[PDB]
Paper text:
The SAGA complex is a regulatory hub involved in gene regulation, chromatin modification, DNA damage repair and signaling. Human SAGA is a 20-subunit, 1.4-MDa complex with five functional modules: a scaffolding core that includes TBP-associated factors (TAFs); a TRRAP (Transformation/Transcription domain Associated Protein) containing a phosphoinositide-3-kinase (PI3K)-related pseudoprotein kinase (ΨPIKK); a histone acetyltransferase (HAT); a deubiquitinase (DUB) and a metazoan-specific splicing (SPL) module. SAGA regulates gene expression by interacting with enhancer-bound activators, recruiting the transcriptional machinery and modifying promoter-proximal chromatin and is known to be involved also in DNA damage repair and signaling. Here we present the cryogenic-electron microscopy (cryo-EM) structure of human SAGA (hSAGA) and show how the arrangement of distinct structural elements results in a globally divergent organization from that of yeast, with a different interface tethering the core module to the TRRAP subunit, resulting in a dramatically altered geometry of functional elements and with the integration of a metazoan-specific splicing module.
Our hSAGA structure reveals the presence of an inositol hexakisphosphate (InsP6) binding site in TRRAP and an unusual property of its pseudo-(Ψ)PIKK. The resolution of our structure allowed us to visualize InsP6 in the positively charged pocket below the TRRAP FAT domain. In the ySAGA structures, the region surrounding this pocket, including residues corresponding to R3051 and K3055 in hSAGA, is poorly resolved and lacks InsP6 density. On the other hand, an earlier structure of the yeast Tra1 subunit17 is better defined in this region and contains an unattributed density where InsP6 is seen bound in hSAGA, potentially linking the stability of the TRRAP FAT domain to the presence of InsP6. Our study revealed that local variations, such as the repositioning of the TAF5L NTD and different interactions of SUPT20H and TAF12 on the TRRAP surface, result in very different interfaces between the structurally conserved cores of ySAGA and hSAGA with the Tra1 and TRRAP subunits, respectively. Consequently, this nonconserved geometry positions functional elements in the core and the activator-binding subunit in totally different relative orientations. Comparison of our structure with that of ySAGA reveals a crucial rearrangement of the TAF5L NTD within the core. A number of mutations, including the prevalent melanoma mutation S722F (TRRAP isoform here, S721F), are part of a highly conserved surface patch and probably involved in effector binding. The first (F859L) localizes directly at the interface with the SUPT20H CTD and the second (R3746Q) eliminates a salt bridge with the highly conserved D291 of the SUPT20H latch.
Numbering used by the authors:
A (entry chain J): 104 to 233, 248 to 331
B (entry chain B): 1 to 203, 255 to 585
C (entry chain E): 10 to 133
D (entry chain G): 59 to 161
E (entry chain N): 507 to 559
F (entry chain F): 5 to 134
G (entry chain C): 1 to 26, 31 to 372, 390 to 428
H (entry chain H): 114 to 181, 188 to 218
Amino acid sequence: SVRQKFDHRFQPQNPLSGAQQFVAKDPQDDDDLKLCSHTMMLPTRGQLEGRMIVTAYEHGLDNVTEEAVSAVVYAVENHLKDILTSVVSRRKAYRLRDGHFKYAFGSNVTPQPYLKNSVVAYNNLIESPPPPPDDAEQQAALLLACSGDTLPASLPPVNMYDLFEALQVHREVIPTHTVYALNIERIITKLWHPNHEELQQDKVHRQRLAAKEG
Amino acid sequence: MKRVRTEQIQMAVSCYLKRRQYVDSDGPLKQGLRLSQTAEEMAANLTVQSESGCANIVSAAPCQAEPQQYEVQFGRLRNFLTDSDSQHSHEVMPLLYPLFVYLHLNLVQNSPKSTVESFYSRFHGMFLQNASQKDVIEQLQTTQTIQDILSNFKLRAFLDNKYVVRLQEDSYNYLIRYLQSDNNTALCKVLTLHIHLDVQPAKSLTTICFYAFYNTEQLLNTAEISPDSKLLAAGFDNSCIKLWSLRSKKLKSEPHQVDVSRIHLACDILEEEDDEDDNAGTEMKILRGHCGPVYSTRFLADSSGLLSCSEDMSIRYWDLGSFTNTVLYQGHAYPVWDLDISPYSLYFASGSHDRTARLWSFDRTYPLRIYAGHLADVDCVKFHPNSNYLATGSTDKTVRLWSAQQGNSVRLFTGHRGPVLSLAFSPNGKYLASAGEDQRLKLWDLASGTLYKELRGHTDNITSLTFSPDSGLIASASMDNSVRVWDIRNTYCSAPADGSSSELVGVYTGQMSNVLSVQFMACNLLLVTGITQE
Amino acid sequence: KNAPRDALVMAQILKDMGITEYEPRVINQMLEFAFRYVTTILDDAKIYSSHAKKPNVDADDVRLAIQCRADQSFTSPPPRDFLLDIARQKNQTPLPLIKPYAGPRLPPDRYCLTAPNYRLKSLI
Amino acid sequence: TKKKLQDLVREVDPNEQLDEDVEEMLLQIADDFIESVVTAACQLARHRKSSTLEVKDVQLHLERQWNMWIPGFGSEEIRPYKKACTTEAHKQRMALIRKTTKK
Amino acid sequence: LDCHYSGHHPQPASFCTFGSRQIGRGYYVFDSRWNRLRCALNLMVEKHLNAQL
Amino acid sequence: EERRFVEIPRESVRLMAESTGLELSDEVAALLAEDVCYRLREATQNSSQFMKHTKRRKLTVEDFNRALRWSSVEAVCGYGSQEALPMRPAREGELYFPEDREVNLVELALATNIPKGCAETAVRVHVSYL
Amino acid sequence: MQQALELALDRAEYVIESARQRPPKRSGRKSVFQKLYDLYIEECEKEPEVKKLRRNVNLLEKLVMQETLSCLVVNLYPGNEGYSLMLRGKNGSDSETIRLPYEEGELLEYLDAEELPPILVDLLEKSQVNIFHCGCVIAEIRDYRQSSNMKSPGYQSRHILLRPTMQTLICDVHSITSDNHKWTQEDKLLLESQLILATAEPLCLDPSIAVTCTANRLLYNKQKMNTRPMKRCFKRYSRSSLNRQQDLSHCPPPPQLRLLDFLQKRKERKAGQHYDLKISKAGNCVDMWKRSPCNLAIPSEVDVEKYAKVEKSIKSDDSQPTVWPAHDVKDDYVFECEAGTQYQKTKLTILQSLGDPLYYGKIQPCKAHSNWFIIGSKTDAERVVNQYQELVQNEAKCPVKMSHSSS
Amino acid sequence: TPLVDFLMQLEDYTPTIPDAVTGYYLNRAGFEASDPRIIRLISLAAQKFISDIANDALQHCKMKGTASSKDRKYTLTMEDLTPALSEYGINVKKPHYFT
């Protein structure tokens, strides 16, 4: 009975058998791409066209309508902004309009919801019927008072861990599997934090600077 | 269009070996012996391979053509090493002499006449007091063209050999902190090619003890016992870990301000509760903090803490001072299957659904090495007794031995008919056992990398293995709710009740449902765990 | 007998993978899974055909719809080739230098779960 | 005009700033994004035997996969809602099952 | 009264390649970064083959 | 060397497509059938993988939904009852359907049904010699 | 525990020391690695010349001159020239490639680590040459990045060994199996297992953690300079980074600095002013209080006494001192409207009596007793006179005249 | 008339969802289920989620038969649930009859 036990198991289809075949063209100087990893900038409209045409060729086409270039540029910028928003949301407060539209990304207003004063201020200062400077100054002071953050603190610049957590949580900002899967692994291999010895040298250097200042 | 034959594989292997020039220009049937070595000769091999190249050339060297800099870099370094008033500034002082000699000698081979003289004038007056080094410092004074360096006798050994220096780890980090602070590329080139820093660390049959869990209800997943046999831990499908004290003592936590298995609102006060002596201990504790089913819990070598992995692709370290998760390792994007710790608690690795395993240190929260190469889920992992090699089982019916420090596959066994589920090394570091759904138990010979022994008799999935502290017996647990101990040592027998005859020693299938674990201890002890019903 | 043919098909699949026993309604779950997958594929094919300005759908539209679906939903980890490249790029970094320890060393506090919220007040 | 990541960041939040590794990673992700989107659009063009990569291909792909709608390119291609009607046999079996349930 | 069956394991009509492309024989890539270098090297080997004749 | 793999009939795929409102040709039906079979087998393997690491033989609906969730696929709702759902044949004897009885809500809404908690876990030691 | 670790570390230190000093000694063709091991064995026997130096430090670079070896050469031209690859031919010939820019540093990463790229091998096999030596390929790196001597060599020939990696082995497995035959998964795994077994490093199977301590020490020392901050620092100054920096000089300024724009645009307009009375550019100095020590020349003739005058005084007898006010000094002022109006013209009288330098005043109304008050001095008297005149005029609200008189 | 602070109000809101259910769900994520405030808030969020779907379903049921009275039994069918659920990206497609 045992021998015919593992003959009908699952055989996943190798993903490379359907890999695209690569054909070599003439090596010219004019035929260049400027992938953004090489030039640390977003590609301009002209630069994008060179690679768009090159890719189109391997699929048996002639040229690009030149309205496609604009759409692709706009989409790339939009997508990058979406990812940036996802990362930002995890370390700053914000407001909501109509239930989803997030605008004010500072950490200021955020009325603490457990204060009787906050409960009263929420009903009025939020629902405004849809501003002399003295009145606005008073109300700004009130909003800062209700926030509760007596001694606010700040964060270091955005590093790898923030990106990793943001990507893991939301995950609807990269619907396509190919883009997400390949880049998440790359992100993992760039996680880093200074170890004990480096912190010791930071200690020593701080002592040195304090001394030379006195 | 037909399946290749067994010999054709050897034929292609030989063709590859010949093309890449690995064997002589004939049948190397003589060759094929160097499949092992001792400690000293391994050290010799690694030392020969260490000096058989340069670790960094292209990026370690400066590219701008601005000879003025060689002065500035050395001047800044001297100023920094002078005003320093540390004990490191001492230990990192000797480097200046080789630095100066080599920088000057490299200037000579490419530098217009203006620069070298200014260089010699600006710093030469600090290598005089010692006698052994005044000789060459003066000799350099009369040197312009390359023929100077080749002709002279003392310059040569410098040019064609490296200078040695000895440092502590703290001192070397002292130099690295400075080197990275600003552009010091020229010095980095000199250190890379010519100087050779050396860093070293600063200064009478057996008896079975059985355990049973009653009220689990299809939730218990795994369990383990610590080496000093004082604790018992288990994981559950509903995310949680429970701990029991085997001894007569109770478990009580100590003060701790922070706990992640708790939620506070903005209107709360952090206060250490004083109504606590009322408790004064208990026999059981619930560890909380994973958000998915748990799949492995392992103890440290000295029973100090606990480590666990879960479906939520996280690994957590539990402190037994307070029974609370205090560290969190995040290095996976898919559920983690297995976990394992090195013999003296130096490393720990983890298999995962993402087709790979990863190496970790207990003092960094990010992986250190990645062992890719399996074709599917890496279900099992085990360290070698010396903690230098790594075995991993996979659903692709294959097992790979890895080189821990370097991280490449050194062996690849085949022969299993179904996925693999367990592994075990003998404490003499000679064999490796493995079992899986096939219901066959294979011991491999690591040196030769070939099948050594095959045992049969179990009728369902084998899910655990272990050796005795003297490679005497190997115990196995199966899904048939049975525990069978085995003996491989020459002592022969005639008891062929099934396929395996002379190895099968004892069988234990008492009133017991699914089994969990099997261990061994100092003297003929074999701890078991599992659930029962009667 | 009592069952329809599809239930037998699903039971046979479960047997093939090596499942001895299981909860009954699993088969109903699998039937709904297949039905939903097929219906969604057809609905996508309709759109892709109407994009090409042609009559009732054919093979090419369906294959395109399936490709678009698989580029999103039915996923699995990347292959061995990509993992080998990232592994090569990772292993080059150095490992810590061993030394005698009075037990394993934990990482620095700033990167451990031992920090209380700064808003909260503490009491003596 | 020249474009940098910080230029996009300012649109979202002026006061934030990234590390260097994050800057490298975001550009790598953008490269992958373009490489996928353009290929998908090219295949959609290949579907209808067309000779040129028209914008409506990109519009369709962006709408269907990434749920993205770029607004300034007209409305020449909006499918008009249909009735989505059912066939004879289907209603037939549904009526049959209703009957079998009634008694 | 037999469930229809085939003699080979089923295959998906269309699946998800990870954007990979095969450079030569037995090598695959995912980023288009070696395109320039591969063109250069191919020409070099072409010429180095031409001259030996 | 000879092996078999049950696959759904063309008729089932055509019957499904009917509800959509499309009449399908011959080749397309077989194409879809093979694709669906491949997806079913993939999902079943993934589900079994989770069960492998728990030491229990029965496969639940939670395992299936978990495997679906990790593979980035919406989950199936309405089958987590742990009680059998018998099927019903119609009059002719070829069509089947599941029993779906109307239920009066207010009765369940107005009713007290105290549940029994669970019991705590405990471990007994059990030595033996051999 | 700590004791066991110390024992293992001592064992590892001893093994390292002995292997460094006392190497053990282990065919038609002798392997390149065999020759490396032998050249290492020799270098141990010798003694060095200089104290604090070693001999066995470059086993490859020395084993190059000792015979001809076919290598792969890399040319790293300076500035923004790029890099290129050369391949020496069988006929004293050569071939070279296009110059690739310094931004596409995909290959340099492989060179930076001594790892054989997989693209290279697929072609190097097609080029029928025997440049392989036990998997590894030796390469020579010439760089004209830094030189201003205008010589023939002008480069530093470095040699390195490009070891094969797990990528190469998988590519090889892919390549061998692409033959006309069929291959089943089991067969591919068998082939891979054989290949791994053949070309794998020997295993030091021994149960003692001294082995891992030795391995960790040796590897750490091999690669102790690849920390993340090191690589960031290298990358921060590499050539591509500089090329990016140059572009930044043309971006505009932020807000709050528009004042620079205003000033720049304003300056150009013009400069001019009529009747410019300034005669100093350095008039905007700070320590204006400083004065240079000035030596004046003696004037020829000083004529002060022509204008000096003495005032009369009452000369002194031998009992009393001099008393200078020589006579009473009286001054009177009168004010009147002069109209027919009744204005009661009034009078003011300053006085300085004999032998008394104080001043006094009185404001009695002039006719048609002794109410004097102290007035300080002459300047005060003038002040009082002015103030009284102003008050009288402001009170009159009509014409008023002043009639001054003396003594 | 009164405007007591939030925590005073919360003690009066009774959730339909029992506390033990919320405890079950909190234990999965690794939290000790003893704080009454957290249990209340989670239960209230779940209740709101279900209530919105119920409201939309009843409105859709009302609109269904308009062209071609008050006293009628309101029953819930899948054709009422499907559009209501689709507001939340839940695509309901269920078979009708098998073979």
